[PDB]
Structure formats: C-alpha cells, structure tokens
Amino acid sequence: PLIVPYNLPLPGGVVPRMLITILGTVKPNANRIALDFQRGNDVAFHFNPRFNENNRRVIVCNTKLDNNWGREERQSVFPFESGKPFKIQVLVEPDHFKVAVNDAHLLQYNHRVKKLNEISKLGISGDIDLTSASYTMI
C-alpha cells in the first residue's frame, strides 16, 4: 500500500511514449480523486474525478500556472465506481496526455505546459487506497 497523498518523481520529466500507471481502489462513498502532473509549483495536468458535483459525476481537467487555475475541460464519461479497483493509465503523446481507465480510453488533454522534460512530479490525492504508481516507455 502507499500513503495518500503520494508523490511519484518523474525523473527528467515526461516525454512522448511514456506511460504512467496508477493502480488502486476507490474508497466507499468517495468524493474526489486527483492526479497532478507538476512542473515545479505549476500543475501541467490536473485530472480530477468528482463523484458528487451537483449530484453528477464528472471528470475535471485543468492546468495551474503561477497559482492560478485556467480553463476547465470537463468529461461526463465517468468510469470510476466507489469501492472498486481501478487502473489509470496516462500516456504522454506529442500534443496531449491520453488517459485510459480500466483499459478504456477516457480523454485527451492538450499540452498547455510545453516543457515536458520539466514536469518532474506526479501527485496522487483523494479518496482512494493506492496500490502502486509507476511508469514505463512503450
């Protein structure tokens, strides 16, 4: 098991064809989960499942620069279920991050932060039991 919030170093940042895999189990009655791919204090890619925003489940994605959130990208396809084991895979591609959950494509998020090799940490937080977090090149 891993303690949440968890920080996964990404040495030398990210690069296309790098695949980051997060395994865990969603807590019962979960409210929120977040992945934060960070460049220093900035958040290049925030991926944030919300289980109860106005009684809807939604995925919110955004970028934080100089402590300011930008424009949210929202996805109502919501593959997580409270109490169940999940896999999040984030594949860095040349123009976007591509996310698949439980082996089904979920969303893409275009790169706003372009210094990919400075996106050197992934933070994992929220209402999960975290089993592992790792990366590989495909």
Ligand SMILES: OC[C@H]1O[C@H](Sc2ccccc2)[C@H](O)[C@@H](n2cc(-c3cc(F)c(F)c(F)c3)nn2)[C@H]1O
């Ligand atoms: O635009 C993403 C951002 O929207 C709000 S702010 C905001 C309000 C209006 C317009 C734009 C932005 C959220 O408050 C913010 N947010 C979530 C979390 C968070 C922290 C945790 F510890 C955790 F476990 C988790 F799942 C999520 N921290 N910051 C962000 O999601």
